[PDB]
Amino acid sequence: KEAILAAKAAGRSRKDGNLERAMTIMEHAMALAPTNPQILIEMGQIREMHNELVEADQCYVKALAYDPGNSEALVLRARTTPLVSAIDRKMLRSVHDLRDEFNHLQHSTALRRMMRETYFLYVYHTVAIEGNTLSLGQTRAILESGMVIPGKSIREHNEVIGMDAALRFLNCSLLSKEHDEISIDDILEMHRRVLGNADPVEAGRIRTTQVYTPVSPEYVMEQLKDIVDWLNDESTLTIDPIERAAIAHYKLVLVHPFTDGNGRTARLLLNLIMMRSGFPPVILPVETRAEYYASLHVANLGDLRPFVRYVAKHSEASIQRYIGAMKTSS
Amino acid sequence: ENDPAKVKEAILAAKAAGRSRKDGNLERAMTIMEHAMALAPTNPQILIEMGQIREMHNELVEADQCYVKALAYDPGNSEALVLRARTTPLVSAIDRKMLRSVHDLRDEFNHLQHSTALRRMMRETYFLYVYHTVAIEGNTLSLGQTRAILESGMVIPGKSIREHNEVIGMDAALRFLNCSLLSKEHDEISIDDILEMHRRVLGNADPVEAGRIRTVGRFTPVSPEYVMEQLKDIVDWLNDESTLTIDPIERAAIAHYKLVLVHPFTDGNGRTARLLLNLIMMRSGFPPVILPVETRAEYYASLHVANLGDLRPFVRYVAKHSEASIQRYIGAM
């Protein structure tokens, strides 16, 4: 409603009134105002006034997605986009050189720290982000002792077990160098181990219905082939590894080829890709769940950049955290 | 290599006696030959003697069993051969009437009129079946724990996750058996039916291996093509009309035996075999057949004898216990 697109004009000369007042007005605005392009635009330039360029550009993109042809949105975005592109391009450059500077030594307990603790960290987070109520210590207990944890459903245990299986397959098959080509049967097998224990009838099997902002119809095998082909194409080595990974996750989640287990397998694929590219394990932490899902939402509006920024953020914070570990361990 | 001397003097003592007076008799001879048995189970002389003692106490089927083992352990042993020659047609008579008795008791199970007391039992029989069939394979979950997991969706903490998954998987397989493989529209038993049962048996506990057969420009004795083909031979034998003319119980025992010997899966063979047994028995109008874990030894003992060439003890075993099953339902009314 226009109570506050009208006050969006109150916030128009509040925006050319130079005040956190403008911001006030735009915030009560936004909280009450969903997909209305004028409101998004106003919010955008207000953000831009607070030197939030990428957030502003985001507002403009959402406005344009909800309203194709909005020429004010068009002229604002036309100006913001190239800036956002430079910024993102060495966001990537930065995480990459921080990666090259990770590869500075082979110490046995870099093996101990990294491999072991980040393995359990990985499994924990990947199932927790989907809603699993297991703790890290309980996840670890499950993998090492295989006894049952009090208060938890057999389904949660099984999600953990499945993930361990999938990870092991990934490591002892798809992460060798002799395995230079990623097959479609490999994605099927990853899903089969991911979901096997929790749902044996559906694990490793393509869905045979449509799901309820939609997802691709059951034309489905072809897109899987597409993904596989794209991964093995030589041109795709010229793309930034992180963007490559994000795009894999995105393609798979958008195809949504299984009845369940799509997200876990997508993060798995992401992780596979960047590990084959010399990166340590990438953990998308459960505390950032909201951000994660939020950015995926924007990805279905046609903008993959929030998600790329997300994956960048967390592979960088990950590597950064390891370094620090070594530095303290002196 | 060498039996202990005490066995030897057991045999020389027993070779000069066994007569009908008061300074020997039965259990004088028997206790001795039994201590001997306890020290040398595979000694043909002890088996033969023990046998003739059994025959004297009107334990014909057991006597015959002794002779069969003696001849199997000692190929060409004619003492065993002639003794068996006397015992065999009698035990055939005995067995045939056992089977007849079990069959008439099955016929009177099917005339029991379905009530709300019966469906109670039917439902409880799921838990009972799953418990026994997994306990036999070594699962340490209790009947109460099994029931709690299947009926209440509980979980026993501090206990193995794998055992939970085995319980759940078996229950799945059993439900599949009842709601797909018993519909009269099915008739033939396909290879996919056995595969589907295995896929449900092992699905939760070991998903990578479930419904999957264990796996020639080099040496190899095993081949997916060869194991698959042996399975095909099994199913074809099951659906062939000639084999419909044999007693369902014997058909079931032989099925169990054949599957266990091909052993087409990396694991879950025994469970799937008991399942197959049960499927066959149910399509012939029997209630589920529960081979109780309390009788585990007997179970394997009979299977032992099967590998010596004699499927009769096993047949007698499954007959005994389907009779106890039907009896479970009959007696509860």
Swiss-Prot record, chain A:
Its main location: endoplasmic reticulum. Ubiquitously expressed, with high expression in the germline. Belongs to the fic family. Protein that can both mediate the addition of adenosine 5'-monophosphate (AMP) to specific residues of target proteins (AMPylation), and the removal of the same modification from target proteins (de-AMPylation), depending on the context. The side chain of Glu-130 determines which of the two opposing activities (AMPylase or de-AMPylase) will take place. Adenylyltransferase that mediates the addition of adenosine 5'-monophosphate (AMP) to specific residues of target proteins. This is Protein adenylyltransferase fic-1. The chain holds residues 145 to 478 of 508 of the full protein. The record marks E130 as: Important for autoinhibition of adenylyltransferase activity. GO terms for molecular function: AMPylase activity; ATP binding; hydrolase activity. Forms homodimers; homodimerization might be required for adenylyltransferase activity. The fido domain mediates the adenylyltransferase activity. It is found in: Endoplasmic reticulum membrane; Nucleus membrane. It is a single-pass membrane protein. The modification O-AMP-threonine is found at T208, T328. The side chain of Glu-130 determines which of the two opposing activities (AMPylase or de-AMPylase) will take place. In response to endoplasmic reticulum stress, mediates de-AMPylase activity. Adenylyltransferase activity is inhibited by the inhibitory helix present at the N-terminus: Glu-130 binds ATP and competes with ATP-binding at Arg-267, thereby preventing adenylyltransferase activity. In unstressed cells, disengagement of Glu-130 promotes adenylyltransferase activity. It comes from the Eukaryota. It comes from Caenorhabditis elegans.
